[PDB]
Amino acid sequence: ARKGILGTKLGMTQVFDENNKVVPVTVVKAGPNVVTRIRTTERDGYSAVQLAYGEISPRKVIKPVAGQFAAAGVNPRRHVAELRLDDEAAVAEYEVGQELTAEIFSDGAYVDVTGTSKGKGFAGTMKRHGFRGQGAAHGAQAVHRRPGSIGGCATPGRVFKGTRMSGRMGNDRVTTQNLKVHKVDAENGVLLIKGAIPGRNGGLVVVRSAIKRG
Amino acid sequence: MIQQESRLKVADNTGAKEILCIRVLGGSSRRYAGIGDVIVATVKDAIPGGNVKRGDVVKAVVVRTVKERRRADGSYIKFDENAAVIIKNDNDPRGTRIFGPVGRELREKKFMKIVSLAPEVL
Amino acid sequence: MNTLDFVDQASLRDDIPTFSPGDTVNVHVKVIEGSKERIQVFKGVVIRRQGGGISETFTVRKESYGVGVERTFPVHSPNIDHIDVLTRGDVRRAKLYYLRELRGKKAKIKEKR
Amino acid sequence: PKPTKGPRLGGSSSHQSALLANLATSLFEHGRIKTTEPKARALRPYAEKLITHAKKGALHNRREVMKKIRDKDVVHTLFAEIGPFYADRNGGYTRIIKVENRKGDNAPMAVIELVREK
Amino acid sequence: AVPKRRMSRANTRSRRAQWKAEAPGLVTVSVAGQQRKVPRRLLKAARLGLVDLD
RNA sequence: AUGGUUUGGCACCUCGAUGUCGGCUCGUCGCAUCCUGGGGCUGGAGCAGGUCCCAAGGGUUGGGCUGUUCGCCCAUUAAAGCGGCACGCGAGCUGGGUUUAGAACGUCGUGAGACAGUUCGGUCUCUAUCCGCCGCGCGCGUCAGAAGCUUGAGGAAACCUGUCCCUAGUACGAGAGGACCGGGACGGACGAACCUCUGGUAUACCAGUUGUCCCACCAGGGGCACGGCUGGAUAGCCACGUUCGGACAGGAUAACCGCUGAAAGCAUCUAAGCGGGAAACCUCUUCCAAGACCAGGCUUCUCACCCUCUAGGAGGGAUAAGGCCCCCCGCAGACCACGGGAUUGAUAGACCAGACCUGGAAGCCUAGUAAUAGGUGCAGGGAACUGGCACUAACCGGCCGAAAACUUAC
């Protein structure tokens, strides 16, 4: 069914396709993943596979995590994340200790990359919500960037919740859908994905088969 | 990148020297007209003896822009002025002679007569 | 070391001649005209070169029929079959943006003798 | 080196440049100075790169130092003892030590000094 | 804007209890023989004789 | 018959103050629907309309004139909807109009003056206590103390649309004209992520240069003049840039189309039933989510040691797994929090190299009367990016932090 892998955003570069068009590609280190646990309906109520990724010194792991990894039967990894499948038929193709690499995907496939958006800090309504500012001249008094009105006058009497105002921005999980895989370099465990994927370089991402275009 | 109230030199021989953009056709609240886009324009400056007159509401197609424009193969084209060619409803020039180079974008937009008449197409 | 270098170098294109801003070149550019091929040559002055490795671009400026034209190409673009350098210019700048305001006699470039 | 991310030290860029030059002159003149911790944090790379210029001490490097130091006795000492003393040490010519807070404004204080071990 | 009402004692005290100071942590050190407490941030300076101990 | 969207009537509400129109900014709701969606009859041949039903998901342009709303006009568009909410919104903004004091015109008055007549000018105050709302923490709880990974009750977001191409110049139609249904591509507006490209920025980058002062002088530099001014300009942040999105499928329905047929020996889409049927609804896509008090699940780690009162419970101390503070930091950040590192170390700085920006350093030599040019030499200088390198700083360290039992069943 839906495949998936844990990886790292390396950066963006340029390639040219066979028709000489240029393709902006994000390079993802779809490094080797090891299956650490299988979630089954008979035990957990849902079907899922849990993958581990990244390298860490064994002295950096705490005793509970090391115990979980030892019970699974593999050496610890930095990152652990779960892939939600649909049914046990889709869970039967994974077993603990199995190694997942970048070649599970193919050239021209469609993927959904999930990462953590870049942080923006405390942002104003103009940046956080695209509010049009007020005028820069013609008498406007210290309202060049302020939101303006906030509600009604009597019948509202309050501010409706969900009202868009300034606050913290970014640092949220974001999924980009229907990205095309331009090339699957099997030597370096590298995926060439056309477009921009969420997060900063060196961030952790999950690449999954697209849910709409697949 | 041409918008409303922008002024364009006329690269034809219809007698119009300069037109002002009134509307960028091709969708509601459309903002900018690049190479190959069709605009509604009014003539601001005209040759004294030409067929067109000042204040005529005409239709033109943008053929040169100062703002550089990306192409499919990653290349860019840029000109030193914004120019337009006055056309009729069948996408044919109202003049008989095109001045200066034009962009390749007029081919995919099916402006074959203008492309043929142009001194050179880039 | 430019971590993406291993990905980059596979698509890097050799045989690019050495040239610097201020030189006069002719870029042989293949074009599509109704599903057939031909090479259209752009002859002008290299006014800038923005280094990036595979993302390298250079800009060539020519005056044609009284209107100046600028074209920016990727250095390793497969849509360029071949670049040929005619003369070497003598300039004191890395980017010749001032040439956008000069015409004819004042827009000429010293030749590196 | 790396510019400061936030507002400059003295209240302006020019004041910060003069402040760094004076602090470096004082450090090379005395061997250790006491100041606020952010000032020493900003001083470390600046003084270390001046010492690097003095290490490969040629006329060009001397003029590079003089376009910052402005004091000639300090330049002479920097190019006659300090440079040769750090001949076979690759970086890390200074160290920062945190000391007790100031009383008038509770400003965190630190001591920056040249290493003298080898 | 001005306060419309006088604060009750409960609200004033509940907000006022948040204005407090934290106790710095202290570690032992041996300077001139005698043991004494010092903040860990100043341990190296104390060992170098750069911090005045009364 | 509805409504209080119009002017009204009453004066119950305030004269120990309830801002008066438009506009801007930001909304939210209704459906009496402007477009898109589904139908019915056509005085519907097709196209296209008329007209009537269902449908509120999204969308619903920019300008000229006027203080205007209103309105007329100009270009478009799928369309340029009608209304409620103090005719929403001045402790959010404006002050053009109206509504003080100056002055003038017409008219009225003997006059002082006046005019729901005109004209020019004319101070818009406030440090947010409470509720509300947008974000971020601290404490306690979730029957030992911890740690990974999670299910999701329940919520929030999003929902737009055009042109062209194949089918097809067929159906219909005297011809003209003109298709249904179904696939494809390219757009406009909007939103998100992102920085390879393009473009902007650039107050510790490189270069040129003006005036002046200083470095004893020359040479070479520096301070100040908006970074003095110019020409560029990597990182970061950005849009004018790049990529992606709005789906598909299922369920129950609206108007409507029906099937099988009673009361009512026929009939009747209906009272028994069974089907189809929409951008509306439920799923489906994305995000938050166990303070979800029914405070969840799957696992893993520690799983122990004293002292006091009177041993009933309590209190105190010391610990484990683990955590926090201090420390080095970050593209994480108002603070806090979050994330990483901490000598069993590449966390930051330095140093070495590369990438990139600038554009040919100094000194010396040569040519020239000199201004200046050429060689040494892709030189010199340099931030953010990449890789090495323990040289400097992450330290002979403090504070927290683990179990009454009972009942029944097996």
Side-chain angles (χ1 to χ4, degrees), chain D residues 1 4-5 8 13 41 44 48-49 52-53 60 63 72 89 91-92 94-95 117:
Chain D
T4 72
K5 202 205 304 194
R8 301 326 180 260
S13 316
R41 288 276 157 81
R44 254 184 72 198
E48 286 214 52
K49 297 196 164 180
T52 299
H53 264 327
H60 187 62
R63 307 259 185 97
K72 283 183 155 194
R89 182 184 299 255
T94 62
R95 81 173 40 108
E117 290 190 322

Coordinates of all heavy atoms in Angstrom, one line a residue, chain D residues 1 4-5 8 13 41 44 48-49 52-53 60 63 72 89 91-92 94-95 117, chain F residues 203-204 215-216 220 224 328 331 333 349-351 361-362 380 382-383 391-393:
Chain D
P1 N 34.7 39.6 11.7 CA 34.0 38.3 11.7 C 32.5 38.4 11.6 O 32.0 39.2 10.9 CB 34.4 37.8 13.1 CG 34.7 39.0 13.9 CD 35.3 39.9 12.9
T4 N 27.2 41.3 14.9 CA 26.2 41.1 16.0 C 24.8 40.9 15.4 O 24.4 41.7 14.5 CB 26.3 42.2 17.0 OG1 25.7 43.3 16.5 CG2 27.7 42.5 17.4
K5 N 24.1 40.0 16.0 CA 22.7 39.7 15.5 C 21.8 40.9 15.9 O 21.1 41.4 15.1 CB 22.2 38.4 16.1 CG 21.1 37.8 15.3 CD 20.3 36.9 16.2 CE 21.1 35.8 16.8 NZ 20.3 34.8 17.4
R8 N 23.8 47.0 18.3 CA 25.2 47.2 18.5 C 25.6 47.6 19.9 O 24.7 48.0 20.7 CB 25.8 48.2 17.5 CG 25.5 47.8 16.0 CD 25.5 46.3 15.8 NE 25.3 46.0 14.4 CZ 24.1 45.6 13.9 NH1 23.0 45.4 14.7 NH2 24.0 45.2 12.7
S13 N 26.9 51.7 15.3 CA 27.9 50.8 14.7 C 29.3 51.5 14.9 O 30.2 50.8 15.2 CB 27.6 50.6 13.2 OG 26.2 50.3 13.1
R41 N 32.8 38.8 25.1 CA 32.3 37.9 24.1 C 32.5 38.4 22.7 O 32.9 37.7 21.8 CB 30.8 37.5 24.4 CG 30.6 36.7 25.6 CD 30.8 35.2 25.2 NE 31.1 34.4 26.4 CZ 30.2 33.9 27.3 NH1 28.9 34.2 27.1 NH2 30.6 33.2 28.3
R44 N 36.5 38.7 21.8 CA 37.4 37.5 21.5 C 37.7 37.4 20.0 O 38.9 37.4 19.7 CB 36.7 36.2 22.0 CG 37.4 35.7 23.3 CD 36.8 34.3 23.7 NE 37.2 33.3 22.8 CZ 36.5 32.1 22.7 NH1 35.4 31.8 23.4 NH2 37.0 31.2 21.9
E48 N 41.5 38.0 18.4 CA 42.2 36.8 17.9 C 42.6 37.0 16.4 O 43.6 36.6 16.0 CB 41.3 35.6 18.1 CG 41.2 35.1 19.5 CD 41.1 33.6 19.6 OE1 41.9 32.9 19.0 OE2 40.1 33.1 20.3
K49 N 41.7 37.7 15.6 CA 42.1 37.9 14.2 C 43.2 38.9 14.1 O 44.1 38.8 13.2 CB 40.9 38.3 13.4 CG 39.9 37.1 13.4 CD 38.8 37.3 12.3 CE 38.1 35.9 12.1 NZ 37.1 36.0 11.1
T52 N 46.2 37.0 14.8 CA 46.5 36.2 13.6 C 47.3 37.0 12.6 O 48.2 36.6 11.9 CB 45.2 35.6 13.0 OG1 44.6 34.8 13.9 CG2 45.6 34.8 11.7
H53 N 46.8 38.3 12.3 CA 47.6 39.2 11.5 C 49.0 39.4 12.0 O 49.9 39.4 11.2 CB 46.9 40.5 11.4 CG 46.0 40.7 10.2 ND1 46.3 40.1 9.0 CD2 44.8 41.3 10.0 CE1 45.3 40.4 8.1 NE2 44.4 41.1 8.7
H60 N 52.5 44.0 5.0 CA 51.1 44.0 4.7 C 50.2 43.7 5.9 O 49.2 44.4 6.1 CB 50.8 43.0 3.5 CG 49.4 43.1 3.0 ND1 48.9 44.2 2.4 CD2 48.4 42.2 3.0 CE1 47.6 44.0 2.0 NE2 47.3 42.7 2.4
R63 N 50.2 46.8 8.2 CA 49.3 47.8 7.8 C 47.9 47.4 8.1 O 47.0 48.2 8.4 CB 49.5 48.2 6.3 CG 51.0 48.5 6.0 CD 51.2 50.0 5.9 NE 52.5 50.4 5.5 CZ 52.9 50.7 4.2 NH1 52.0 50.7 3.3 NH2 54.1 51.0 4.0
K72 N 50.7 53.0 18.3 CA 51.9 52.4 17.6 C 52.7 51.6 18.6 O 53.3 50.6 18.2 CB 52.7 53.5 17.0 CG 52.1 54.1 15.7 CD 53.0 55.1 15.1 CE 52.8 55.2 13.6 NZ 53.9 56.0 13.0
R89 N 51.0 28.1 18.2 CA 49.6 27.8 18.7 C 48.6 28.2 17.6 O 48.6 29.3 17.1 CB 49.4 28.6 20.0 CG 48.0 28.3 20.6 CD 47.7 29.1 21.8 NE 48.7 28.8 22.9 CZ 48.4 28.1 24.0 NH1 47.3 27.6 24.2 NH2 49.4 28.0 24.9
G91 N 45.2 29.2 17.0 CA 43.9 29.7 17.6 C 43.9 29.6 19.1 O 44.8 29.0 19.7
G92 N 42.9 30.1 19.6 CA 42.7 30.1 21.1 C 43.7 30.9 21.8 O 44.3 30.4 22.8
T94 N 43.1 33.7 23.5 CA 42.5 34.3 24.6 C 41.6 33.4 25.3 O 41.2 32.3 24.8 CB 41.7 35.6 24.2 OG1 40.7 35.2 23.4 CG2 42.6 36.6 23.5
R95 N 41.3 33.7 26.6 CA 40.3 33.0 27.3 C 39.4 34.0 28.1 O 39.9 35.1 28.4 CB 40.9 32.0 28.3 CG 41.4 32.6 29.6 CD 41.9 31.6 30.6 NE 42.6 30.5 29.9 CZ 43.9 30.3 30.0 NH1 44.7 31.1 30.7 NH2 44.5 29.3 29.4
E117 N 50.3 29.7 28.6 CA 50.7 28.4 29.2 C 52.0 27.9 28.5 O 52.9 27.5 29.3 CB 49.6 27.4 28.9 CG 48.4 27.6 29.8 CD 47.4 26.5 29.7 OE1 47.2 25.9 28.6 OE2 46.8 26.1 30.7
Chain F
rU203 P 23.3 45.7 7.6 OP1 23.3 44.5 8.5 OP2 22.4 46.8 8.0 O5' 24.8 46.3 7.7 C5' 25.0 47.7 7.3 C4' 25.9 48.4 8.3 O4' 25.4 49.8 8.4 C3' 25.8 47.8 9.7 O3' 27.0 48.0 10.4 C2' 24.8 48.7 10.4 O2' 24.9 48.8 11.8 C1' 25.1 50.1 9.7 N1 23.9 51.0 9.7 C2 22.8 50.6 9.0 O2 22.6 49.6 8.5 N3 21.8 51.6 9.0 C4 21.8 52.8 9.6 O4 20.8 53.5 9.6 C5 23.0 53.1 10.3 C6 24.0 52.2 10.3
rA204 P 27.6 46.9 11.3 OP1 26.6 45.8 11.4 OP2 28.1 47.5 12.6 O5' 28.9 46.3 10.6 C5' 30.0 47.2 10.2 C4' 31.3 46.4 10.2 O4' 31.6 46.0 11.6 C3' 31.4 45.2 9.3 O3' 32.7 45.0 8.9 C2' 31.1 44.1 10.3 O2' 31.6 42.8 9.9 C1' 31.8 44.6 11.6 N9 31.2 44.1 12.8 C8 29.9 44.1 13.3 N7 29.8 43.5 14.4 C5 31.0 43.0 14.7 C6 31.5 42.3 15.8 N6 30.8 41.9 16.8 N1 32.8 42.0 15.8 C2 33.6 42.4 14.8 N3 33.2 43.1 13.7 C4 31.9 43.4 13.7
rC215 P 49.5 64.0 14.0 OP1 50.3 64.3 15.2 OP2 49.8 64.8 12.7 O5' 49.7 62.5 13.6 C5' 49.4 61.5 14.6 C4' 49.5 60.1 14.0 O4' 48.5 59.9 13.0 C3' 50.8 59.8 13.2 O3' 51.9 59.5 14.0 C2' 50.3 58.6 12.4 O2' 50.3 57.4 13.2 C1' 48.9 59.0 12.0 N1 48.8 59.6 10.7 C2 49.0 58.8 9.6 O2 49.2 57.6 9.7 N3 49.0 59.4 8.3 C4 48.8 60.7 8.2 N4 48.7 61.2 7.0 C5 48.6 61.5 9.4 C6 48.6 61.0 10.6
rA216 P 53.4 59.6 13.4 OP1 53.3 59.7 11.9 OP2 54.2 58.6 14.1 O5' 53.9 61.1 13.9 C5' 53.2 62.3 13.6 C4' 54.1 63.3 13.0 O4' 55.5 63.1 13.4 C3' 54.2 63.4 11.5 O3' 53.1 64.0 10.9 C2' 55.5 64.0 11.2 O2' 55.4 65.4 11.4 C1' 56.4 63.5 12.3 N9 57.2 62.3 11.9 C8 57.2 61.1 12.4 N7 58.1 60.3 11.8 C5 58.7 61.1 10.9 C6 59.6 60.8 9.9 N6 60.2 59.6 9.7 N1 60.0 61.8 9.1 C2 59.4 63.0 9.2 N3 58.5 63.4 10.1 C4 58.1 62.4 10.9
rG220 P 49.9 55.7 -2.0 OP1 49.4 54.9 -3.2 OP2 49.4 57.0 -1.7 O5' 49.7 54.8 -0.7 C5' 50.0 53.4 -0.7 C4' 50.0 52.9 0.7 O4' 50.8 53.7 1.6 C3' 48.6 52.9 1.4 O3' 47.8 51.8 1.0 C2' 49.0 52.9 2.8 O2' 49.4 51.6 3.3 C1' 50.2 53.8 2.8 N9 49.9 55.2 3.0 C8 49.8 56.1 2.1 N7 49.5 57.3 2.5 C5 49.3 57.1 3.9 C6 49.0 58.1 4.9 O6 48.7 59.3 4.7 N1 48.9 57.5 6.1 C2 49.2 56.2 6.4 N2 49.1 55.8 7.6 N3 49.5 55.3 5.4 C4 49.6 55.8 4.2
rC224 P 33.8 57.7 12.6 OP1 32.8 57.3 13.6 OP2 34.0 56.9 11.4 O5' 33.5 59.2 12.2 C5' 33.2 60.2 13.2 C4' 33.0 61.5 12.6 O4' 34.2 62.0 12.0 C3' 32.0 61.6 11.4 O3' 30.6 61.7 11.9 C2' 32.4 62.9 10.7 O2' 32.0 64.0 11.3 C1' 33.9 62.8 10.8 N1 34.6 62.2 9.6 C2 34.8 63.0 8.5 O2 34.4 64.1 8.5 N3 35.5 62.4 7.5 C4 35.9 61.2 7.5 N4 36.5 60.7 6.4 C5 35.7 60.4 8.6 C6 35.1 60.9 9.7
rC328 P 29.1 29.9 29.1 OP1 30.2 30.8 28.9 OP2 27.7 30.4 29.1 O5' 29.1 28.8 27.9 C5' 30.4 28.4 27.4 C4' 30.2 27.6 26.1 O4' 29.5 26.4 26.4 C3' 29.4 28.3 25.0 O3' 30.1 29.2 24.2 C2' 28.8 27.1 24.2 O2' 29.8 26.6 23.3 C1' 28.6 26.0 25.3 N1 27.2 26.0 25.8 C2 26.3 25.2 25.0 O2 26.7 24.6 24.0 N3 25.1 25.1 25.4 C4 24.7 25.7 26.5 N4 23.4 25.6 26.9 C5 25.6 26.5 27.3 C6 26.8 26.6 26.9
rC331 P 20.6 31.1 14.9 OP1 21.3 31.9 13.9 OP2 20.2 31.7 16.2 O5' 19.4 30.4 14.3 C5' 18.1 31.0 14.3 C4' 17.2 30.3 13.3 O4' 17.7 30.5 12.0 C3' 16.9 28.8 13.5 O3' 15.6 28.5 13.1 C2' 17.9 28.2 12.5 O2' 17.6 26.9 12.1 C1' 17.8 29.3 11.4 N1 19.0 29.3 10.5 C2 18.9 29.0 9.1 O2 17.7 28.8 8.7 N3 19.9 29.1 8.3 C4 21.1 29.3 8.8 N4 22.2 29.3 8.0 C5 21.3 29.6 10.2 C6 20.3 29.5 11.0
rG333 P 11.0 30.7 16.7 OP1 9.6 30.8 16.2 OP2 12.0 31.1 15.8 O5' 11.1 31.6 18.0 C5' 10.4 31.3 19.2 C4' 11.0 31.9 20.4 O4' 12.4 31.5 20.4 C3' 11.0 33.4 20.4 O3' 9.8 33.9 20.9 C2' 12.2 33.7 21.3 O2' 11.8 33.6 22.7 C1' 13.2 32.6 21.0 N9 14.2 33.0 20.0 C8 14.3 32.6 18.7 N7 15.4 33.1 18.1 C5 15.9 33.9 19.0 C6 17.1 34.8 19.0 O6 17.8 35.0 18.0 N1 17.3 35.4 20.1 C2 16.6 35.3 21.3 N2 17.0 36.0 22.3 N3 15.5 34.5 21.4 C4 15.3 33.9 20.2
rG349 P 30.7 29.9 15.5 OP1 30.2 31.0 14.6 OP2 31.1 28.6 14.9 O5' 32.1 30.5 16.1 C5' 32.1 31.7 16.8 C4' 33.3 32.0 17.5 O4' 33.5 31.0 18.6 C3' 34.6 31.9 16.7 O3' 34.9 33.1 16.0 C2' 35.6 31.6 17.8 O2' 35.9 32.8 18.5 C1' 34.9 30.7 18.8 N9 35.1 29.3 18.4 C8 34.2 28.4 17.9 N7 34.8 27.2 17.7 C5 36.1 27.4 18.2 C6 37.1 26.4 18.3 O6 37.1 25.2 18.0 N1 38.2 26.9 18.9 C2 38.4 28.2 19.3 N2 39.6 28.6 19.8 N3 37.4 29.1 19.2 C4 36.3 28.6 18.7
rA350 P 35.6 32.9 14.5 OP1 35.5 34.2 13.9 OP2 35.0 31.7 13.8 O5' 37.1 32.6 14.8 C5' 37.9 33.5 15.6 C4' 39.1 32.8 16.2 O4' 38.7 31.7 16.9 C3' 40.1 32.3 15.1 O3' 40.9 33.2 14.6 C2' 40.8 31.2 16.0 O2' 41.8 31.8 16.8 C1' 39.7 30.7 16.8 N9 39.0 29.5 16.3 C8 37.7 29.3 15.9 N7 37.4 28.1 15.5 C5 38.6 27.4 15.6 C6 39.0 26.1 15.2 N6 38.1 25.2 14.7 N1 40.3 25.7 15.4 C2 41.1 26.6 15.9 N3 40.9 27.9 16.3 C4 39.6 28.2 16.1
rC351 P 41.2 33.3 13.0 OP1 42.0 34.5 12.8 OP2 39.9 33.1 12.3 O5' 42.1 32.0 12.8 C5' 43.4 31.9 13.4 C4' 43.9 30.5 13.2 O4' 43.1 29.5 13.9 C3' 43.9 30.0 11.8 O3' 45.0 30.4 11.1 C2' 43.9 28.5 12.0 O2' 45.2 28.0 12.3 C1' 43.0 28.3 13.2 N1 41.6 28.0 12.9 C2 41.3 26.8 12.3 O2 42.1 25.9 12.1 N3 40.0 26.6 12.0 C4 39.0 27.5 12.2 N4 37.8 27.2 11.9 C5 39.4 28.8 12.8 C6 40.7 29.0 13.1
rA361 P 46.8 46.0 -7.6 OP1 46.2 47.3 -7.9 OP2 48.2 45.8 -7.9 O5' 46.7 45.8 -6.0 C5' 45.6 46.4 -5.3 C4' 45.9 46.3 -3.8 O4' 45.8 44.9 -3.4 C3' 47.2 46.7 -3.3 O3' 47.3 48.1 -3.1 C2' 47.4 45.9 -2.0 O2' 46.7 46.5 -1.0 C1' 46.7 44.6 -2.4 N9 47.6 43.5 -2.9 C8 47.6 42.9 -4.1 N7 48.5 42.0 -4.2 C5 49.2 42.0 -3.0 C6 50.2 41.3 -2.5 N6 50.9 40.3 -3.3 N1 50.7 41.5 -1.3 C2 50.0 42.4 -0.6 N3 49.0 43.2 -0.9 C4 48.6 42.9 -2.2
rA362 P 48.5 49.0 -3.7 OP1 48.0 50.4 -3.8 OP2 49.0 48.3 -4.9 O5' 49.6 48.9 -2.6 C5' 49.3 49.1 -1.2 C4' 50.3 48.4 -0.3 O4' 50.0 47.0 -0.5 C3' 51.8 48.6 -0.6 O3' 52.3 49.7 0.0 C2' 52.4 47.3 0.0 O2' 52.5 47.4 1.4 C1' 51.3 46.3 -0.3 N9 51.5 45.4 -1.5 C8 50.7 45.4 -2.6 N7 51.1 44.5 -3.5 C5 52.2 43.9 -2.9 C6 53.1 42.9 -3.4 N6 53.0 42.3 -4.6 N1 54.1 42.6 -2.6 C2 54.2 43.2 -1.4 N3 53.4 44.2 -0.9 C4 52.5 44.5 -1.7
rG380 P 47.2 36.5 -2.8 OP1 48.3 35.8 -2.1 OP2 46.0 35.7 -3.2 O5' 46.7 37.6 -1.8 C5' 47.6 38.7 -1.4 C4' 46.8 39.9 -1.1 O4' 46.1 40.4 -2.3 C3' 45.7 39.8 -0.1 O3' 46.2 39.8 1.3 C2' 44.8 41.0 -0.4 O2' 45.3 42.2 0.1 C1' 44.9 41.0 -1.9 N9 43.8 40.2 -2.6 C8 43.9 39.0 -3.2 N7 42.8 38.6 -3.7 C5 41.9 39.5 -3.4 C6 40.5 39.6 -3.7 O6 39.8 38.8 -4.3 N1 40.0 40.8 -3.2 C2 40.6 41.7 -2.5 N2 39.9 42.8 -2.1 N3 41.9 41.7 -2.2 C4 42.5 40.6 -2.7
rG382 P 41.2 40.0 6.1 OP1 41.3 40.6 7.5 OP2 42.1 38.9 5.8 O5' 39.7 39.7 5.9 C5' 38.7 40.6 6.2 C4' 37.4 40.3 5.5 O4' 37.5 40.1 4.1 C3' 36.7 38.9 6.0 O3' 36.1 39.0 7.2 C2' 35.8 38.6 4.8 O2' 34.6 39.4 5.0 C1' 36.6 39.2 3.6 N9 37.2 38.1 2.9 C8 38.5 37.7 2.9 N7 38.8 36.7 2.1 C5 37.5 36.4 1.5 C6 37.1 35.4 0.6 O6 37.8 34.6 0.0 N1 35.8 35.5 0.3 C2 34.9 36.4 0.8 N2 33.7 36.4 0.4 N3 35.3 37.3 1.7 C4 36.6 37.3 2.0
rA383 P 36.3 37.9 8.3 OP1 36.9 38.5 9.5 OP2 36.9 36.7 7.7 O5' 34.8 37.5 8.7 C5' 34.0 36.8 7.8 C4' 32.6 36.8 8.3 O4' 31.8 38.0 7.9 C3' 31.7 35.6 7.7 O3' 31.9 34.4 8.4 C2' 30.3 36.2 7.7 O2' 29.7 36.0 9.0 C1' 30.5 37.7 7.5 N9 30.4 38.1 6.1 C8 30.8 37.5 5.0 N7 30.6 38.2 3.9 C5 30.0 39.3 4.4 C6 29.5 40.5 3.7 N6 29.6 40.6 2.4 N1 29.0 41.5 4.5 C2 28.9 41.3 5.8 N3 29.4 40.2 6.5 C4 29.9 39.3 5.7
rC391 P 44.7 20.6 21.9 OP1 45.2 20.4 20.6 OP2 45.3 19.8 23.0 O5' 44.9 22.1 22.3 C5' 46.0 22.9 21.8 C4' 45.6 24.3 21.6 O4' 45.1 24.5 20.3 C3' 44.5 24.9 22.5 O3' 45.0 25.2 23.8 C2' 43.9 26.0 21.7 O2' 44.8 27.2 21.8 C1' 44.1 25.5 20.3 N1 42.8 24.9 19.8 C2 41.7 25.7 19.5 O2 41.8 26.9 19.7 N3 40.6 25.2 19.0 C4 40.5 23.9 18.8 N4 39.3 23.4 18.3 C5 41.6 23.0 19.1 C6 42.7 23.6 19.5
rU392 P 44.1 25.1 25.1 OP1 44.9 25.4 26.3 OP2 43.4 23.7 25.0 O5' 43.0 26.2 24.9 C5' 43.3 27.6 25.1 C4' 42.1 28.4 25.0 O4' 41.5 28.4 23.7 C3' 40.9 28.0 25.9 O3' 41.1 28.5 27.2 C2' 39.7 28.7 25.2 O2' 39.7 30.1 25.5 C1' 40.1 28.5 23.7 N1 39.5 27.3 23.1 C2 38.2 27.3 22.7 O2 37.5 28.3 22.9 N3 37.7 26.2 22.2 C4 38.4 25.0 22.0 O4 37.8 24.0 21.5 C5 39.8 25.0 22.4 C6 40.3 26.1 23.0
rA393 P 40.5 27.6 28.4 OP1 40.9 28.2 29.7 OP2 41.0 26.2 28.2 O5' 38.9 27.6 28.3 C5' 38.2 28.8 28.6 C4' 36.8 28.7 28.2 O4' 36.6 28.5 26.8 C3' 36.0 27.5 28.8 O3' 35.7 27.6 30.2 C2' 34.8 27.4 27.9 O2' 33.9 28.4 28.2 C1' 35.4 27.7 26.5 N9 35.8 26.5 25.8 C8 37.0 25.9 25.7 N7 37.0 24.8 24.9 C5 35.7 24.8 24.5 C6 35.0 23.9 23.6 N6 35.5 22.9 23.0 N1 33.7 24.2 23.3 C2 33.1 25.3 23.9 N3 33.7 26.1 24.7 C4 34.9 25.8 25.0

